[PDB]
Amino acid sequence: QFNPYGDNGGTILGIAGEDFAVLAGDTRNITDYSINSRYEPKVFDCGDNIVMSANGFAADGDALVKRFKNSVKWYHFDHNDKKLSINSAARNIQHLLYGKRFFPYYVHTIIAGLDEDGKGAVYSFDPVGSYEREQCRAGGAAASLIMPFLDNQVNFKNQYEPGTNGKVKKPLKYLSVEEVIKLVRDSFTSATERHIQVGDGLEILIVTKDGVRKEFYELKRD
Amino acid sequence: NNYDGDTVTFSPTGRLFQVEYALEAIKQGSVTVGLRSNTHAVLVALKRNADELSSYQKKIIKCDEHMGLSLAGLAPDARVLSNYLRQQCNYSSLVFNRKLAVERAGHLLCDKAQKNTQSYGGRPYGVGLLIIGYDKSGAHLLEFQPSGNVTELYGTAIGARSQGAKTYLERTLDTFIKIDGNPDELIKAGVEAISQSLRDESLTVDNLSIAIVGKDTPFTIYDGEAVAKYI
Amino acid sequence: GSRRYDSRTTIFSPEGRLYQVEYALESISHAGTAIGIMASDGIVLAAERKVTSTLLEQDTSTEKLYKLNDKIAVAVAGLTADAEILINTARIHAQNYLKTYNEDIPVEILVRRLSDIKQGYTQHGGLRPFGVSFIYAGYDDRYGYQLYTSNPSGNYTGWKAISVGANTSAAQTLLQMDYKDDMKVDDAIELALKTLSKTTDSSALTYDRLEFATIRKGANDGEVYQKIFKPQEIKDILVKTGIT
Amino acid sequence: TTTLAFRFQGGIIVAVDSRATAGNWVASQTVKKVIEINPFLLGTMAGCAADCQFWETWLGSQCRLHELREKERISVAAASKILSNLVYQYKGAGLSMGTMICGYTRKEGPTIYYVDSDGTRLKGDIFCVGSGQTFAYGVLDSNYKWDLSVEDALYLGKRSILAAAHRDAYSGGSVNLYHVTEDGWIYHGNHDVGELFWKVKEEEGSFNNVIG
Amino acid sequence: SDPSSINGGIVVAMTGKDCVAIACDLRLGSQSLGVSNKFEKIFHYGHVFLGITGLATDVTTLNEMFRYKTNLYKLKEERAIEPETFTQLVSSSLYERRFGPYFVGPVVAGINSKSGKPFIAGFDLIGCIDEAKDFIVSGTASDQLFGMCESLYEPNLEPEDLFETISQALLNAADRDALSGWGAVVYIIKKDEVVKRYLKMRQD
Amino acid sequence: TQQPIVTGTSVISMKYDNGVIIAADNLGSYGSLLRFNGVERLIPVGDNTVVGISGDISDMQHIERLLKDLVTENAYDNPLADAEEALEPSYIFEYLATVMYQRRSKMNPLWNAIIVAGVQSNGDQFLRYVNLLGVTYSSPTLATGFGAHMANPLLRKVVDRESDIPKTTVQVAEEAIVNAMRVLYYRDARSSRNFSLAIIDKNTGLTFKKNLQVENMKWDFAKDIKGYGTQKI
Amino acid sequence: MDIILGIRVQDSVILASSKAVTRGISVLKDSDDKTRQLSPHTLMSFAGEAGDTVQFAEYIQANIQLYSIREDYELSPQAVSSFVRQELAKSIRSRRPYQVNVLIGGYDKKKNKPELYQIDYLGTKVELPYGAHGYSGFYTFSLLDHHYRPDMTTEEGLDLLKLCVQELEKRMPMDFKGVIVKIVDKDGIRQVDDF
Amino acid sequence: GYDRALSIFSPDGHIFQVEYALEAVKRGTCAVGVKGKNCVVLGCERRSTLKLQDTRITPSKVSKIDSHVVLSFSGLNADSRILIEKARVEAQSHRLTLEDPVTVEYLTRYVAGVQQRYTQSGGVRPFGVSTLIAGFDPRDDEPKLYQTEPSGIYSSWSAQTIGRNSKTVREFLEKNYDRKEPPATVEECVKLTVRSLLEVVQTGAKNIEITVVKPDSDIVALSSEEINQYVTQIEQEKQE
Amino acid sequence: DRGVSTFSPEGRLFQVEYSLEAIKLGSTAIGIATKEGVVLGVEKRATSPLLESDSIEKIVEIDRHIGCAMSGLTADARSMIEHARTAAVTHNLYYDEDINVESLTQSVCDLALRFGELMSRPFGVALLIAGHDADDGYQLFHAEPSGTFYRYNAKAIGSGSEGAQAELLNEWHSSLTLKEAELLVLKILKQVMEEKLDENNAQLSCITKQDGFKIYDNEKTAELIKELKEKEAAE
Ligand SMILES: [Mg+2]
Ligand SMILES: [Mg+2]
Ligand SMILES: [Mg+2]
C-alpha cells in the first residue's frame, strides 16, 4: 500500500528576544538510517521580515513554505504593498494548514519575526493549524531533548535564589542576541550528541528591525 | 451599422465594429508613454482626475518583480488582464522556477483577448496596455490592443493625443535607445516624450506616474513627490 | 446570435399584462365549452366536443374529461396535448402524496401544484405557456365537494358553478340565473345540459358531441364514485332532461 | 485537559487548565483553552485544538455578520447552534471537539451550551470537559450554589481546575479564569498551578497527603 | 445482522381448482423480541394479491410503491392489472435495485379476470421469477414450508379443501420457526369472491 | 495507488570542478527476473541536462514523453529556444518535482526516484533529487536505491563537502563513479554489468557514453573458499 | 439516548422518556427532554445516536409546522407517522443514516381517538397500544401485557407506567435519572411535573 | 438554460419590466394596511365581477406566513403564491437555526430581497406583486406594517394601501390617520380600515375582507356579518 | 434587440451609461473627509407622510471602521452591502486585522461589470464608501456601476450632485474639523433638497478612529440643524 508520508528528520528552534527573534535549524536531511544531504536549508526568509520553517515531512514542508511565500506576494498585490505583520501571517498559515485538515501537511511549523511594536515574536503550529505565540519553541526530532533545557536556562524554571531555599525565584532577566545564540548552539550541540538524526550543520536566521541575518555553524557529522 | 450589434458579426468589408468601438475607448483614455534602452525600460503615464476634489486614477500596475504595465481605456478590464498576467507570471515561477518572458506574456494576452472577439455573448476588452519588462533577453516594451494585436517596440504611446509623443520618440529613437546605465536620463526622455501630448494642462506632482524596470532594478512605481525631481 | 429569434415569452406589456398568457386565453376561448356545477350531493362535469365526425370512434374517445384519481377529475378547454402533459404530472403528484402520507391528496393541494407549474412557464424558462384551462371536480373529507378552475397564468379560483372555453360570458350568465345553493345533482345535470344547449355554436346538442361525468356520494354508503358517462348513457340523459 | 463553565447569580465563570500533551510528552504548558469569540462570547477548547480554534474563530465571524445584518446582539442559543449545525455537517469526517459556548444576553441571561463534534448541543448550568473533568466535577458539585459571589465563584472554578491538575496527568501548567457578564467577559488572570498548589495547600489546609 | 431475518415472517401461496390461496403469519419482531402480532404481509391491488416477507421497512415501502404503480397503471390502461403483468412489474422493480436491493421475498397470487386461470409466482430479492404450478413459499421458515407443502399438496383441490391444506402448511411450519407465528391469515380467492380467515394458533 | 512492475535500480551522480556526472545500468527487472537488458534510464534534455530515473519503467517512459513534449512546447513561439530561452536543468527539475508531488497528492504516484543532472547558463553545476513522494534534496553526491547505501559512501570520500568540488577533476570523478558501479554490480542482486554514463561539462558540453561495462572484477579469491565453516575440501 | 416508553389508553397517549444524557464516563445532564411537539395534538419522543436524534426531531418538527401553516390544518397522527417513516426509510439507504428511533403519540381530532406509533431507525412502523425502543420493552412488556386494558383512564395509565419505571430502576444496570412524562389528548399536550 | 436579460436599463435610466410589473399591481384589487396602538388590520377588496364563487375554498387574499405574521398583496395572484411559499419556508428555517421566529422586518427584508433578485437575474421577469406584511415581533407589543414592491425596495408604514384606486384611499388615510394618536382599539382600527375601502369598493357586501392581527400570535379574520355591521354604522353616521 | 454588454460608437457600455441616468434620479448623498473623520449624509425622500422615515436605510455599516451611503435604485445596494460585509469579515478571519478601505472598495467594484448573457444588468446605484485605516487614514471613495472608484476629499451623488459638488468645491479645505464638516453636509443637503430639511427627512453619520462608524440620532442631528440655522443668520 502506498504511504504518502515520510520522515526527513531535522530539528528546529525558535526563540523570541526583547527586540529580536531567531529561528534555527540543523541542515541534515535523512530517510531511515541514511543521510540525503548534509546541507539542505530548512529555515527560509519569506519576506516582510518573516522567517519560517516547516519541519517533518520535507515535501509537505517545502509545499507549505512555497504557498506562504506566494501568499505574501499576493497580499502585496491585493493590499497596496502593505507589510504582512507576523500576527497576520500566523492566522494566514492556520488557514493554509486547516485547508488540508483531512489530508494534513505532516509538519511542525514555526515562524519568527517582530510584532507591530518591534518586540520579538515566535509562532508555533501543529500539523492541522492550531497555533500560539510563544517565547521559546523547539520542533522536530530532538524537541524533547531541547525544550526542558530551555525551560531551565531561558525561563529559569526550578531555579531559585541562593539562601532563600525555594522562597524566591530566580528573576527573569532579558537575554541578548549573543546570549540566545549561545543557548541555541549548546542546544544543538547536545542534541547532536544524543540524537542520530541531528548533525552536520546549524543555520540560524536572526531577525531585527534592520532585517534578516544568517549565521552558520558546523555540527558533528557522525 | 447593421453589423455592429455584436462581436460575432463581420461587416461586408470584413470589419469587426465592436472591436473597433472597443479600440475607440482607448483613444478617449489618458495618454501613457513607454520607452526602453538596452538596460532599462520605462513607463510614463498622465493620470486623470474626475475633478479637483478627486484623486488621480492610477495607470500603472505591477505584474511581477520583473514585469508590469500601464493602461489606457476601461480600468476594470486592465485589472482583469493584469490579474491574468500576474497569475501567468506566477505559474511560470512556481512550476518552472522561471521568470515569464515578456514576449510570451504578450502572446498570452493576445490569445485571451481573441476569445472575446469570436464568441457570442461576450464583448471585447475596452483597454490598451503598455507592458515593460526585463528578462533573460534584456529590456522589452510591448503594446497591447484589445483586438488581440500585441507588438514589441522600442517606444510608443497610447491614449488621447498620443500621436505627439509617438512622433517625438520616432525622432529621438537613436538617442534614447543608447541611454544605458542611466535610469534618470531615460525617464527624462519619457517625461519629455509625454509632454508632446499635453494641452492646457502640465505635469504636476500628483498628475505624473512613472515606472521603471531594468538590469538590477525591480519593477517599481513612482508617484507623488518621488516624481517632483522630473517635473 | 440566437437572441435575434427569441420571442421573449415571459415579459410584461407596458400595461402590466403577460402577452403570452393573454394570447393563450384567446386560444382557449375557441375551445369547446366545458361546464362544472357543484351540488350538495355531488358535482357535474359537462363538456362539448369540437365539431366532430360520424366516423369518429366516440366510445373510445376522450378529449375533455380526465380522471386524476378516484376522487378528482378534470374538464379540459384548450390544447388537448398540452393538457395531457399536465394531467400526467397531476396524477403523479396525487400518487406521491398518497405514498408519503398514506392519505388521498386534498383537492386544493393538487390544484395549487398544477397551477404553480403553469405559473413557472410565465416567469422563467423562455418557453410558451400551456394553452389549457382546467375545471377541477373533486372530493375530500375536509371541504367535501369542490370545483376549481385554473388558466395559463397559473391563477386558480373556487366555484359553485363555472364554465371555460367558448361562450363563457353567455354560459356564466345562464348559470348565475338558475343556480341555487340547495340544488341537487339531478338538477345540476339538467342545468349543465340546458346551458350547453343554449350556448353551443352547433345547430343542436346531441349525444355524440358531448362528454359527461358526475362525482357522487351516490356510492354505496360513506364513499365517492366517479362516473364517466358512456355514449348511450349521454343519449339517455338527453332524452330524460327533454333536450332530444 | 480540564475545562469548566458554570452559571451563577453574577453570570458565568469559565476556568481552564493550560497543558497540551502528545502522548506522555508535555508539548506546552501555556496553551490558551478559552477562545475569545468576541467581547461577549467565550468558548472552551477540548479535543482537537485546531478544530476548536478554527471553528470558534469562524463562529465569531458569523456572529459579527449576524449583528451587522440584524442590528442586534446574537443570542447564545443562535451562536451555539451555528457551531453545532456546522460540525454536524462534518459528522463522521473526524472532527474532535468538546466545547462550552458561554454568553450573557438580555433575553436569555447567563447561558451555557455544551457543543460537541458528534452533533450534541446541550443547555445547562454546569459543564466540565476533558481528561480531568471528573475531578473538577467533584469540587464543583459539592460547593456550587446559585447565590455564590463573583469572588467565591472565581475561586471555586480555580480550585476545581487545581483538583484536576493535581490528579490528572494530562492537566496542569496554569489556570486561566474568566467572568462573563452581560456587558462582556472579564479576564481574571493566569495562575501557575505550581505556585497555586502550595498557596492553596497552606491557606486551605487541603492536600494533607502531599508533603510541603 | 442478516436483513432478511431481523423481523421474521412467512408467506405461502397455493393453486386449486378455479381458485388460489395465499397466507401469511402476523409476527413482526426485533430479532428475539416480538413487537407486533398484527403485521399482515399480504396486500392487494385490485384482484391481484401480493405477499411480502423479509425486512419490514422494505415490505411497507414496496407495498406503497406497487400501490403507486398499479394506481397509475389503472388510470392509463383503464383496467385493473393482471397477475401475469404485475409479476413482471415486481421483477422489473426489484432488479432496478440490483446493487442496493430490497431485502424481501415477494409472492404473487391471483386469477386472470379474462381467462379465469389461477396464477401464483415467487421472487428472490433481485427479481428472479419462480412461476410454479403448485405452490410458492417465502420467509424465515421457507424450508419448513417446502416440507409441509411438498407432502400435503395435491392438485385441483376445491376452495374449502385448499383452505385446510394451506392453513396446515403455514401453521405447522411457523411452529418450527422462532421468528414466525403470533397469528395467521388465509385468503381464499375465486374469480369473483375472496374470503379472508384469521386462524387460531399458539402465541409463543 | 499501484505497485511497480518492471523496475530499474540505482542511479548515481556527483559534482566535479567543471560539471556533473550521472550513471545508471541498463536493466529492467521483473521482480527477481532480469527481464529486459537494453533499457536506457538516462534521458538527455537538450545539451545541458540529463535526467536519471529509477523505479517503475512504465512511469519512466511516461516521464520521458513529458520531457520530450516539454522541449517541443518550449520551442513554440520562441526565437531564442536554442539560446537564452532554452530549457535549463533547474526548469526541468522544478517541472518534474511539481508533477511528482501533485501525483502523490492524488494518491496516484509516479513510482520513481529521479536525479536531474546538468549545467546552468552561468556555468553553475546542477544536481537535485526528487522521488515518488515529491521529496527533494541536493548534495555534492546523489544516488537512488542501493546506490544511496553503497555508492554515496564512496563518492563522498572524493567530495565530502562543497569546498571539495573545485578540487575534483573530471577524471577523478568519472573514476569514482565507475568504481561505484562495479561495487553495485558485486552487491545489488537487481543490477547488471552494462550501464550508461553521462558527463555534462560547462566547457565540453554533454558527453553521453553508452554500452559501458563493469571491468577489473575480483573473483579469483573465491577458489579458496570452501564450505561454510568446517569443510576442508 | 436510553429509555422511551409509550402507552395509549382510552382517551390519551402517554409518553415517558428518560432524563439522563451520558457522554461515556460522566452523566452530563439529568433533566434532558427527549421530545418535540410536531403539532398541537402530536408529540414525538426519540432515542438513538447523539446529535442525530435532536437534528432529526427538529427537522421533522419544522416540516410539520410548515405543512400546518401552508394548509391552515393539522395533519392526522397517522399522516404524520407515515411522513416520519418515509424520512427514516429514505435515511437508512443514505450515505450516513439517521440512527434515531421514535415514538409518535397523537390524538386524532377527527376520529376522537388516541394513537401511538412506534418507528425505528430503519423505518419500521407499527401502531400499538403500548410500545418502547431499545431494551425498555424487555423489562416492561410483561407488565403491560398483564395489566393493560383498552378502556384504561389516564390515571390508571400513569400508575401502570410507574410500575414499569420501577421495574426498570430495579433491573437495569444504567441510571437513567428518572423520566419526563407527557400526556397527549383532545386538549393538546401537557407535562406531568411530578413523577 | 434560458439566460436572457429581460430586466434592463433604458436610455432614460428606467427598467421597464420592473415598471410594467408595477402596472400589474395597479390592476390588482385594492389592499390596505392600518396599524393601531396594539394591533394591525389588513383590509382587502374583492371584485364582485365573480359571483357563483365558492368562498370557502377560493384562495383568501391574506395569508399567514407564520403564526405571528401575515401577508396580503395586490397584483398577479399566481406570482404571490411563489413569494408566500418562499416566505413560509424561510420563516421555518429561521426558527430552526436561530431558535426564534422571524421579526416582521426580517421577513419583509427577505421577501423584498427575492423580488429584487428577480429584477437582475437572467431569464426571469419581476414579480407583478406588491405586498403588505404585518404582525408583531416575538415577545413584542409594538405593531409592525411594511410594504414591498416589484423593484425590491421596502419600508415601514403607519398606514398604507396598494392596488387599484390606491391613490384615492391613500388620500383618505393621509387626512384621517393621526400619528400622535393612532386607532387606540381594534374597533377604531377596523372602522378606519373599512372606511378607507368604502371610498373605492362599491357595495360593502362580500367585497370587503378584514383580518385583525394582535400580539402573541392572535390572528383572526372577520366574517361577512361582522364587517357588515361596520359598513352599516359608517353610513348611518354619514347621513348627517 | 442588442447585447447587454454592447459598446457604443463612442466606446462606452450602453447599460453602464444608462444605469448612471438612474443614479441621477436618486436621492442626494454627500460625503466629506477630514483629518478628524469622514462625514456621510443622505436625503431620505419619503414618498408619503404615512411612511415611517426611520425605516429608510440609505446609510449602512460595512464594518466598525467602514461606513457606506447610497443613491439610486437602493434595492440593488443590498447584495453589494452583503458582499462588502462578507469581504470585511472574511479578511479579518484570514488575516486577524482590519481590511483597508481601498481594498474593500475594490472588492465591491469587482462585482460591477459581472453582467451579461452572472447578473442580467449593472447595478443601478452608486455608493459613497467612507472609512479609516492605519496606513492611509480617513478616506472617502465613490463606487460606480462602471467598476471605477475615485477617492475624494468630498463628494456628492444623486439628483442634486452637480450643484452640491460645486458647493463642495468652494467650501472644502484641508483643515476642516469634524463639526465643520457636519454643518457643511447639512448646509448643502438643505440647498439641493426639494422639501425643507429636518431631522426626519435627512440623516447624518460619521466614521472616526476612536468610536468607529456611527449613525447619528435624530435628536443629535436636530441640534446640528439648529446650530446651522443660527450661524447662517449670524451674517
Ligand atoms: Mg553516523
Ligand atoms: Mg413459531
Ligand atoms: Mg416465544
CA pair distance F183, E152, nearest whole angstrom = 86
The torsion of the CA quartet D19, D22, D26, D28, rounded to 10 degrees, works out to -50
Sign of CA dihedral B176, B181, B183, B184: negative
Contacts of B24 in chain I (CB under 8 A): 7, 9-11
Residue I95, domain extent = 1-235
Is D49 assigned to a binding site? Answer: yes
The Cα-based distances of B208 to B46, B57, B79, B130 in angstroms read 5, 11, 20, 16
Q: Which three cell numbers stand for residue E134?
A: 403448485
The gap between the terminal CA atoms of chain H, to the nearest Å, is 65
CA pair distance H206, H54, nearest whole angstrom = 12
I75/H151 touch (CB, cutoff 8 Å), yes or no: yes
CA pair distance D33, D16, nearest whole angstrom = 6
CA pair distance I62, I98, nearest whole angstrom = 12
CA pair distance F102, F133, nearest whole angstrom = 9
* Closest to D173 measured CA to CA, from D27, D42, D12: D27
CA pair distance H37, H186, nearest whole angstrom = 9
Sign of CA dihedral E24, E28, E29, E30: positive
**Domains by residue range for chain A, with CATH:** 1-222 (3.60.20.10)
A70/B62 touch (CB, cutoff 8 Å), yes or no: no
Q: Which three cell numbers stand for residue C175?
A: 348559470
H98/D81 touch (CB, cutoff 8 Å), yes or no: yes
CATH number for the domain whose boundaries are H1-240: 3.60.20.10
Strand partners, I59: I69
CA pair distance H31, H44, nearest whole angstrom = 4
Q: What is the 3-state secondary structure (H, E, C) of chain I?
A: CCCCCCECCCCCEHHHHHHHHHHHCCCCEEEEECCCCEEEEEECCCCCCCECHHHCCCEEEEECCEEEEEEECHHHHHHHHHHHHHHHHHHHHHHCCCCCHHHHHHHHHCCCCCECCCECCCCCEEEEEEEEECCCEEEEEEECCCCCEEEECEEEECCCHHHHHHHHHHHCCCCCCHHHHHHHHHHHHHHHCCCCCCCCCEEEEEEECCCEEEECCHHHHHHHHHHHHHHHCCC
DSSP letters of H71-89? EEEEE-HHHHHHHHHHHHH
Q: How many CB atoms lie within 10 A of CB B157?
A: 28
Is residue F170 helix, strand or coil?
helix
At least 3 CB pairs under 8 A between chains G and F: no
CA pair distance B145, B109, nearest whole angstrom = 9
CA pair distance H82, H228, nearest whole angstrom = 32
CA pair distance G54, G99, nearest whole angstrom = 11
Q: I110: number of CA atoms within 13 Å, CB side?
A: 13
CATH number at residue D166: 3.60.20.10
Q: Which three cell numbers stand for residue E9?
A: 415472517
Q: Are strands D184-192 and A131-134 parallel, antiparallel or unpaired?
A: unpaired
CA pair distance F67, F60, nearest whole angstrom = 11
Residue with cell 482537537: D48
CA pair distance E145, E151, nearest whole angstrom = 10
Yes or no: say if D6 and D125 are a contact pair by the CB < 8 Å rule.
yes
Q: How many CB atoms lie within 10 A of CB D170?
A: 18
Ligand number, closest to the Cα atom of E175: 2
Yes or no: say if H73 and H131 are a contact pair by the CB < 8 Å rule.
yes
Touching check for B12 and chain C: CB below 8 Å?
A: no
Domain parsing of chain B, residue ranges: 1-231
Q: Are strands B217-222 and B60-64 parallel, antiparallel or unpaired?
A: unpaired
In angstroms, what separates the C-alpha of G80 from chain C's closest C-alpha? 7
CATH number at residue G190: 3.60.20.10
CA angle D141–D143–D148, rounded 5-degree value? 120
Q: How many CB atoms lie within 10 A of CB E130?
A: 13
To test the contact with chain G by mutation, choose from H92, H94, H100 the residue with the greatest count of G C-beta atoms within 10 A, namely H92
D82/H97 touch (CB, cutoff 8 Å), yes or no: yes
| List of residues 6+ apart from G46 with CB closer than 8 A | G1, G4, G34, G35, G36, G53, G54, G56, G57, G100, G101, G102, G103
CA of E178 from ligand 3 middle (Å) equals 7
Yes or no: say if D105 and D73 are a contact pair by the CB < 8 Å rule.
yes
CA pair distance B133, I106, nearest whole angstrom = 26
Number of domains in chain I: 1
Contacts of I117 in chain C (CB under 8 A): 3
Q: Residue H237, Cα to own-chain centre: how many angstroms?
A: 28
| List of residues 6+ apart from G159 with CB closer than 8 A | none
Query: If residue C43 lies in a helix (H) or strand (E), which one and from where to where?
Result: strand C42-48
CATH number at residue I143: 3.60.20.10
The Cα-based distances of H174 to H25, I54, I194 in angstroms read 21, 18, 20
The Cα-based distances of C121 to C22, C124, H78 in angstroms read 13, 6, 11
Sign of CA dihedral A195, A198, A201, A206: negative
Position E199: which residue type?
Answer: L
Is residue D53 helix, strand or coil?
helix
Give the DSSP letter of residue E111.
E
Contacts of I2 in chain B (CB under 8 A): 5-6
CATH number for the domain whose boundaries are B1-231: 3.60.20.10
Yes or no: say if H91 and H102 are a contact pair by the CB < 8 Å rule.
yes
CA pair distance A5, A105, nearest whole angstrom = 9
The structure's method of determination equals X-ray
Residue F142, domain extent = 1-233
* Closest to I126 measured CA to CA, from I108, I139, I114: I108
Q: Which three cell numbers stand for residue B12?
A: 461586408
At least 3 CB pairs under 8 A between chains C and D: no
Q: Which three cell numbers stand for residue D132?
A: 480531568
Give the DSSP letter of residue H124.
B
Yes or no: say if I40 and I67 are a contact pair by the CB < 8 Å rule.
yes
CA pair distance I100, A75, nearest whole angstrom = 12
CA pair distance A204, A45, nearest whole angstrom = 11
The Cα-based distances of H58 to H46, H52, H94 in angstroms read 11, 11, 29
The torsion of the CA quartet C100, C101, C102, C107, rounded to 10 degrees, works out to -100
CA angle G49–G52–G56, rounded 5-degree value? 130
Q: Which residues of F are catalytic?
A: 1
Position D2: which residue type?
Answer: T
Residue with cell 343542436: C204
Q: Which three cell numbers stand for residue H119?
A: 429584477
Q: Are strands G130-132 and G4-8 parallel, antiparallel or unpaired?
A: antiparallel
Which residue among A128, A134, A144 places its CB closest to the CB of D50?
A128
* Closest to D96 measured CA to CA, from G53, A128, A132: A128
Position F99: which residue type?
Answer: V
Residue with cell 498570452: B108
CA pair distance C13, B223, nearest whole angstrom = 54
Q: Which three cell numbers stand for residue E126?
A: 433481485
Yes or no: say if A169 and A9 are a contact pair by the CB < 8 Å rule.
no
Q: Which three cell numbers stand for residue D177?
A: 479564569
Edge-first strand listing for the sheet containing B67-73:
B60-64, B67-73, B127-135, B138-144, B150-152
* Closest to F134 measured CA to CA, from F169, F170, F96: F96
The Cα-based distances of A47 to A69, A73, A76, A89, B87 in angstroms read 7, 9, 11, 11, 19
Number of domains in chain F: 1
The Cα-based distances of C60 to C208, E74, E77 in angstroms read 12, 16, 12
In angstroms, what separates the C-alpha of F74 from chain B's closest C-alpha? 10
Residue with cell 476533558: D130
CA pair distance G15, G103, nearest whole angstrom = 8
| Extended strands (E) in chain G | 4-8, 13-18, 21-23, 26-29, 35-39, 42-48, 100-108, 113-119, 125-127, 130-132, 179-185, 188-192
Strand partners, E188: E21, E195
Q: Phi then psi for A26, rounded to 5 degrees?
A: -70, 160
Number of domains in chain E: 1
Residue D140, domain extent = 1-212
At least 3 CB pairs under 8 A between chains F and E: no
CA pair distance D182, F48, nearest whole angstrom = 72
Number of domains in chain G: 1
CA pair distance B140, B158, nearest whole angstrom = 17
CA pair distance F21, D125, nearest whole angstrom = 74
Query: If residue D33 lies in a helix (H) or strand (E), which one and from where to where?
Result: none
Is residue F89 helix, strand or coil?
helix
Longest dimension (CA), chain E: 47
CA pair distance A82, A48, nearest whole angstrom = 9
Yes or no: say if B89 and B105 are a contact pair by the CB < 8 Å rule.
yes
CA angle B178–B184–B189, rounded 5-degree value? 60
Strand partners, I41: I30, I204
Buried b (16+ CB within 10 A) or exposed e, B53-88: bbbbbebbbbbbbbbbbbbbbbbbbbbbbbeebbeb
In chain D, where does DSSP find H-type helix?
A: 49-70, 76-89, 133-143, 150-167, 193-204
Q: Which three cell numbers stand for residue C10?
A: 415571459
Q: Checking phi first, is residue A81 left (phi over 0); if not, alpha (psi -120 to 50) or beta? A: left
Yes or no: say if D157 and D100 are a contact pair by the CB < 8 Å rule.
no
Edge-first strand listing for the sheet containing C144-150:
C65-67, C72-78, C132-140, C144-150, C156-159
In H103-223, where does DSSP find H-type helix?
A: 104-117, 166-176, 186-198
Query: If residue H101 lies in a helix (H) or strand (E), which one and from where to where?
Result: none
Sign of CA dihedral H18, H24, H28, H30: positive
CATH number at residue C114: 3.60.20.10
Which residue among G89, G93, G131 places its CB closest to the CB of E100?
G93
Q: I11: number of CA atoms within 13 Å, CB side?
A: 20
CA pair distance I28, I48, nearest whole angstrom = 18
CA pair distance I188, I163, nearest whole angstrom = 9
CATH number at residue F187: 3.60.20.10
CA pair distance C71, C90, nearest whole angstrom = 13
DSSP letters of A52-94? EEEEESHHHHHHHHHHHHHHHHHHHHHTTT----HHHHHHHHH
Which residue of chain F has the CA closest to B100? F85
| List of residues 6+ apart from C144 with CB closer than 8 A | none
Is residue E73 helix, strand or coil?
helix
CA pair distance B180, B4, nearest whole angstrom = 47
Residue G70, domain extent = 1-195
CA angle B205–B209–B212, rounded 5-degree value? 130
Question: How many residues are there in chain H?
Answer: 240
CA of E1 from ligand 3 middle (Å) equals 20
Yes or no: say if D212 and D202 are a contact pair by the CB < 8 Å rule.
yes
To test the contact with chain I by mutation, choose from H32, H125, H155 the residue with the greatest count of I C-beta atoms within 10 A, namely H155
Yes or no: say if C98 and C105 are a contact pair by the CB < 8 Å rule.
yes
* Closest to G49 measured CA to CA, from G34, G61, G59, G62: G34
CA pair distance E121, E137, nearest whole angstrom = 9
* Closest to D206 measured CA to CA, from D144, D174, D173, D160: D160
| List of residues 6+ apart from A174 with CB closer than 8 A | A17, A18
Q: What is the 3-state secondary structure (H, E, C) of chain B?
A: CCCCCCCCCCCCCCCCHHHHHHHHHHHHCCCEEEEECCCEEEEEEECCECCCCECECCCEEEEECCEEEEEEECHHHHHHHHHHHHHHHHHHHHHHCCCCCHHHHHHHHHHHHHCCCCCCCCCCCCEEEEEEEEECCEEEEEEECCCCCEEECCEEEECCCHHHHHHHHHHHHHHHCCCCCCHHHHHHHHHHHHHHHCCCCCCCCCCEEEEEEECCEEEEEECHHHHHHHC
Longest dimension (CA), chain G: 48
Strand partners, I139: I131
* Closest to H200 measured CA to CA, from H178, H234, H171, H157: H171
Residue C177, domain extent = 1-244
CA pair distance B217, G174, nearest whole angstrom = 77
Query: If residue D205 lies in a helix (H) or strand (E), which one and from where to where?
Result: none
Touching check for I73 and chain H: CB below 8 Å?
A: yes
CA of A109 from ligand 1 middle (Å) equals 27
> Residue H152, class by beta-carbon neighbours within 10 Å (0-12 exposed, 13-18 middle, 19+ buried)?
buried
